[PDB]
RNA sequence: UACCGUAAGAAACAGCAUCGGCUAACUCUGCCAGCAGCCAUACGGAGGAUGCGAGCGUUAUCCGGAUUUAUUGGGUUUAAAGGGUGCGUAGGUUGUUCGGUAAGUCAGCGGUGAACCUGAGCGCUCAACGUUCAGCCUGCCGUUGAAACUGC
RNA sequence: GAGAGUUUGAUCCUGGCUCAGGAUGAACGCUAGCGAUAGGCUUAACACAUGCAAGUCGAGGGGCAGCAUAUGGCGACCGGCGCACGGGUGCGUAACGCGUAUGCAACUUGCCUUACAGAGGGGGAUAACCCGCGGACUAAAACCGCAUACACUUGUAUUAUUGCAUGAUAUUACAAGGAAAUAUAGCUGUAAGAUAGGCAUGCGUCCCAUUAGCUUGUUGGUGAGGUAACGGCUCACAAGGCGACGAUGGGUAGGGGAACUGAGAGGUUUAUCCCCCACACUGGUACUGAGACACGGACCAGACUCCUCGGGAGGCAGCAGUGAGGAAUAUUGGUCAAUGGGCGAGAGCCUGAACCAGCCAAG
């Protein structure tokens, strides 16, 4: 019965650490203003992304989202 | 009325009551004796009828009569209590089942021995 | 090849709101109990982008997907004013 | 369950000697209690039905809820209701075996389908409400083909007249060609008021 | 998965299968996609009912036997790589000319002699 | 399935004055009771008879007759039941005729709708039951037509 | 598709009532032989002790206590899959919850099937072991990079066709980004299928008007965020929306097919059976996971109960005892032989599902 919470447990910080990590890229990149630093860490946080989304912490649907919605603004500036 | 009154309104259907309603559906109940007594029938009838004041378990107050021959009930007798009215007597609408819990079967009965509860003679 | 959307054919009996009408669509048909006929609407709330209908007017509406919280209409074709 | 009483006090209480013929319907012809023979009290039309339907019963040897089964098949089958009940009362496989004289009463033909006397189509039958259907062959089971009983009974019926029932004394067995019309069966039974007494 | 298995339906002592196409998670005797066959173990020839085409179709989709519903479409034949022959064609197994072997096997009948003389 | 020897191990319950199928004696307030009612063709026992029968009676609950909520299918002078009388809002109903429309209405085609329940079989020695197949789909939805009637 | 009696001195009506008939998961009284086939806490989502009910893989890994001289296998540990099903209950809920019919050009889907491609290199931890609760060492199909996928996602452009408005589909791309497992059967990406869910709709869905006004994210818009997904789902102008065709409030109830009943119309109930929903001592919050109201998971707060002075446990609406309540309902039984389910390459293991046996006037 303790198999099943230590698993539990050793997952849910596995987890939580890497989506807390993409989620504070997402949000350092949506406050840059220069076009050509957003263009050159833009490759990164999607590569860190669809990352997320193959180990399965996220869906592919919601990276997909972001993906889309970043570059967006990488091309309104 | 019309078929627009009817539309606008329509028919009312209202449930009977029960005959019993202190057995609340169930078919018997089991009750407590306060006062076995005795009463008078209605003006065609003259005899002196044996009767039970019964509290039953749902906390309900029963006029129950007690059928056959005489009886061995007193106060705080379990007795089972059964629907039934007696017709010259009034308010008195359960019976007694003779021969369960304190209550005994009529002795000397031969015939009709199932309704008054006597085994059958050796 | 598509999968034909629901179709109504009302009248619109408000626009008092931003891009949205409701449209009442009446009809007739017998008791479910007594067999008389009787009348009953039902009231819908359609998409207008262009706010090309007024008060009145008969109009046909199309089922799409939720466009609002309870907004599930859109004005396809306008058959008289 | 069996009726298993007297028999002779159905038979006085009935008149017709519906259990065969016996030496004591006569010199009495009453029916049985210290209330009989004393003149006839008014039955009613109700109290005709239900003697007629238990002197079927009694005959037969049928009780009520099977009786009732039996009324609700014929009406459910196509034809006269009263002259199909007869039909399927006749029908029964102790009526069958007695008609075909194997045993003197019905209730002997009843006793021996119970103790597995008697074969259907090759195979031992033994319910005595078994429905015999025309085309079938009844006979004596091959290891009782010598008993006693069955030799004394079949002494004296090589008539077999009964135009419904082929017999064949060289197998020990019969069988039916068809229905029988109600006229034909040698009952005298009025189902009409049966067949009133159950649909009223 | 999608399944085909058999669902009990006969009474006690008597039992009688119904062959139908259910997912896995399904209670035993409740809800089924479809209905193919039937199989009556009681009787020693086996009958077995079951419908050829749909049977294939399932099997053909990825619908996983058990034991003994594998074992009912092998004896009907639904097992066959006549269509996954790809390099053949017109490939008529006539397998169902063997598969017919008529087991009419009786018992011989003997009977008591009544020697009741007296 | 077969052999030993055995009628041997196996019947009760409720009625019996009319309705209701069943009768006379002995007792006598005790009682009975669905009703008419009975303190004896009605109470208790005895003998008989009548229902049913491994069951038979009692109570409870539900349904039908019950048209006692009446669309099918009830009424309102005096049995319960016309508002004290008008005007009038919503609603319900709308003389005759011509032409459109097709909402109601009618028709065709298509889809959809385990077990149980209905004719025919098959298997349970029969039967309950199990099972197969023909006959129900008589609702809903979609799509084509008709225009007598109602609606617009 | 049929009944009877009863208001009077007598009659014809009106009108209620009482008896006849059928049925039950019934109970009670008297009595009781068998077989077959059904059913068995209807009263409280009452309370207790014991046992079982979900595990499996040594063809994943380090190992080796129970055996042959790690090899048979296997306690524990890491790891994979399953426990969200089967099974139980009817509290709540008058609601797109349920039935019936559709839509998603607003969706997701582990295991299973098919087709097209690919399985190249590398790194660090920490269970167990060992030394004492703390420390040290180490492996994997555990975890994480780098390389390659242009079948996928994102962005842009071109061409063509087309729909139901938002639009959809198919060639052309250039650009960026995303995988894998090996052992003696497998793994990864994509597409299609099958299966299973989700959302939204038309119609139908109990009484009270001695309940007539209700509503401020409430109705619509713009934008953003968020979600598998559309959307006041959430967050930063206009005043609209719903209402006698019954809003709002109050009471009551899980809903259907069945079943029963009646000539039919219809009425009664959902006991056993099947489908959908809700729930797991009472609330709240999430985590893990393809999937969660998490039925043999966790945390917190309550109350109740039990065993212990530092505290620790349980939840009987899984199956059998028992107690209580009640008119009233059974064995702390056998087996995985059959059917179904989980895991495993298979043999196989487990299965209070199930199949059986026991008890009960018992339909
Ligand atoms: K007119
Ligand atoms: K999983
Ligand atoms: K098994
Ligand atoms: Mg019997
Ligand atoms: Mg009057
Ligand atoms: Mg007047
Ligand atoms: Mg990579
Ligand atoms: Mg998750």
């Given at each position: 019965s303790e198999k099943r919470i230590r698993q539990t447990n050793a997952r849910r910080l596995h987890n939580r650490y890497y989506a807390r990590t993409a989620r504070n890229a997402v949000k350092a990149f949506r406050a840059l203003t220069d076009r050509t630093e957003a263009e050159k860490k833009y490759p990164v946080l999607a590569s860190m992304l669809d990352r997320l989304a193959g180990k399965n912490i996220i869906h592919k649907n919601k990276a997909a989202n972001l993906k889309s919605k970043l570059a967006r603004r990488i091309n309104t500036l | 009325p019309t078929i627009q009154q009817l539309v606008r309104?329509?028919?009312?259907?209202?449930?009977?009551?029960?005959?019993?309603?202190?057995?609340?559906?169930?078919?018997?109940?089991?009750?407590?004796?306060?006062?076995?007594?005795?009463?008078?029938?209605?003006?065609?009838?003259?005899?002196?009828?044996?009767?039970?004041?019964?509290?039953?378990?749902?906390?309900?107050?029963?006029?129950?009569?007690?059928?056959?021959?005489?009886?061995?009930?007193?106060?705080?007798?379990?007795?089972?209590?059964?629907?039934?009215?007696?017709?010259?007597?009034?308010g008195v609408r359960y019976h007694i089942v003779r021969g369960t819990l304190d209550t005994a079967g009529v002795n000397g009965r031969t015939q009709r021995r199932s309704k008054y509860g006597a085994k059958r003679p050796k | 090849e598509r999968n034909l959307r629901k179709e109504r054919v009302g009248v619109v009996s408000s626009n008092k709101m931003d891009k949205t009408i409701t449209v009442a669509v009446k009809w007739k048909e017998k008791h479910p109990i007594y067999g008389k006929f009787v009348n009953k609407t039902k009231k819908y709330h359609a998409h207008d982008e262009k706010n090309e209908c007024g008060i009145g007017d008969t109009v046909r509406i199309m089922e799409t997907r939720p466009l609002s919280r309870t907004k599930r209409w859109r004005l396809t074709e306008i058959i008289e004013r | 369950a069996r009726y298993t009483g007297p028999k002779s006090k159905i038979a006085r209480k009935f008149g017709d000697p519906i259990f065969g013929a016996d030496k004591v319907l006569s010199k009495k012809n009453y029916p049985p209690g210290q209330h009989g023979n004393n003149r006839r009290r008014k039955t009613s039309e109700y109290?005709?039905?239900?003697?007629?339907?238990?002197?079927?019963?009694?005959?037969?040897?049928?009780?009520?809820?099977?009786?009732?089964?039996?009324?609700?098949?014929?009406?459910?089958?196509?034809?006269?209701?009263?002259?199909?009940?007869?039909?399927?009362?006749?029908?029964?496989?102790?009526?069958?075996?007695?008609?075909?004289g194997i045993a003197p009463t019905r209730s002997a033909a009843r006793?021996?389908?119970?103790?597995?006397?008697?074969?259907?189509?090759?195979?031992?039958?033994?319910?005595?409400?078994?429905?015999?259907?025309?085309?079938?062959?009844?006979?004596?089971?091959?290891?009782?083909?010598?008993?006693?009983?069955?030799?004394?009974?079949?002494?004296?019926?090589?008539?077999?007249?009964?135009?419904?029932?082929?017999?064949?004394?060289?197998?020990?067995?019969?069988?039916?060609?068809?229905?029988?019309?109600?006229?034909?069966?040698?009952?005298?039974?009025?189902?009409?008021?049966?067949?009133?007494?159950?649909?009223? | 998965?999608?399944?085909?298995?058999?669902?009990?339906?006969?009474?006690?002592?008597?039992?009688?299968?119904?062959?139908?196409?259910?997912?896995?998670?399904?209670?035993?005797?409740?809800?089924?996609?479809?209905?193919?066959?039937?199989?009556?173990?009681?009787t020693n020839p086996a009958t077995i009912d079951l419908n050829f085409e749909r049977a294939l179709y399932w099997i053909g989709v990825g619908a996983q036997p058990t034991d003994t519903a594998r074992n009912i479409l092998s004896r009907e034949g639904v097992l066959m790589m006549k269509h996954l022959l790809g390099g053949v064609k017109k490939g008529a197994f006539d397998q169902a000319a063997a598969e017919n072997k008529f087991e009419a096997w009786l018992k011989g009948k003997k009977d008591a002699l009544n020697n009741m003389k007296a």
């Open positions: - | 309104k329509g028919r009312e259907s209202f449930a009977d009551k029960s005959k019993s309603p202190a057995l609340n559906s169930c078919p018997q109940r089991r009750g407590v004796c306060v006062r076995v007594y005795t009463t008078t029938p209605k003006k065609p009838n003259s005899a002196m009828r044996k009767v039970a004041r019964v509290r039953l378990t749902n906390s309900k107050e029963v006029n129950a009569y007690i059928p056959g021959e005489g009886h061995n009930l007193q106060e705080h007798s379990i007795v089972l209590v059964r629907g039934g009215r007696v017709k010259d007597l009034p | - | 109290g005709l039905q239900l003697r007629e339907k238990q002197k079927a019963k009694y005959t037969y040897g049928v009780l009520e809820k099977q009786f009732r089964h039996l009324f609700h098949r014929a009406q459910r089958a196509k034809g006269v209701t009263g002259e199909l009940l007869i039909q399927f009362l006749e029908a029964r496989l102790d009526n069958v075996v007695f008609r075909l006793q021996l389908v119970s103790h597995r006397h008697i074969t259907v189509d090759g195979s031992v039958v033994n319910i005595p409400s078994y429905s015999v259907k025309p085309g079938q062959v009844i006979g004596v089971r091959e290891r009782s083909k010598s008993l006693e009983v069955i030799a004394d009974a079949l002494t004296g019926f090589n008539h077999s007249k009964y135009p419904w029932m082929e017999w064949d004394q060289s197998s020990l067995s019969g069988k039916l060609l068809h229905m029988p019309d109600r006229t034909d069966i040698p009952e005298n039974i009025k189902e009409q008021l049966i067949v009133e007494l159950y649909s009223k | 998965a999608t399944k085909i298995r058999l669902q009990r339906h006969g009474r006690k002592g008597y039992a009688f299968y119904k062959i139908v196409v259910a997912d896995s998670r399904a209670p035993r005797d409740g809800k089924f996609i479809e209905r193919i066959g039937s199989y009556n173990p009681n």
